[PDB]
Design a protein around this ligand. Sequence first.
Ligand SMILES: Nc1nc2c(ncn2[C@@H]2O[C@H](COP(=O)(O)OP(=O)(O)OP(=O)(O)O)[C@@H](O)[C@H]2O)c(=O)[nH]1
Ligand SMILES: [Mg+2]
Length: 208
Amino acid sequence: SELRIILVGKTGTGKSAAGNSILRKQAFESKLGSQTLTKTCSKSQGSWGNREIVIIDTPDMFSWKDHCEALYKEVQRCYLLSAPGPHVLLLVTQLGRYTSQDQQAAQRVKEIFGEDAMGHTIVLFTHKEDLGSLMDYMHDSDNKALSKLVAACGGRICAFNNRAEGSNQDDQVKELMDCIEDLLMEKNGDHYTNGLYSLIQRSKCGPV
Ligand SMILES: Nc1nc2c(ncn2[C@@H]2O[C@H](COP(=O)(O)OP(=O)(O)OP(=O)(O)O)[C@@H](O)[C@H]2O)c(=O)[nH]1
Ligand SMILES: [Mg+2]
């Protein structure tokens, strides 16, 4: 009954904060500061409905240049923590701040997870409070790069205010879970997979 989610995207967009919003607890270190905080992948979990939500937070692996002390190692850690594959890649972006570095992050997502990764990706917009409606912003946006990203993700978008509490927090998480359910329906309940994921899964069952 696991539902596995990997938080991906540019550094500082509110990845760790989003994981915290979803799990409704302080699972991942998140705070104000100009430098990158998350330096290693982390895993946490919680229940929602009748599924165990499993979330993998990520360091700055999606930057164009290597900004990791051990990039290859952290990618491997990400794979091992999410095996046999994520149900969702949550591509975290800050609303009104989709830059070339965000475009780079999306390319790095495809490099690390495969050219088909976008098919299991949902675009999460953080800083929702900075808005009208999310749909209205999208239509009014002349950010062509962002429109391409959203189209590549089949129009699957959701907005969070990571500082949301109580009922507001609930509603936004409900919205995300609705998005996830719709994606899972489209994919016949399957998680994302690729050759490295299947290789890990086979290795784990051991020599015969
Ligand atoms: N107001 C507001 N602040 C946010 C939102 N999302 C994240 N933040 C803040 O932005 C700061 C950075 O958040 P993080 O959770 O560390 O973001 P991150 O993407 O994990 O950052 P790195 O691990 O450094 O790459 C924190 O102070 C958060 O409280 C949001 O939706 N609204
Ligand atoms: Mg973080």
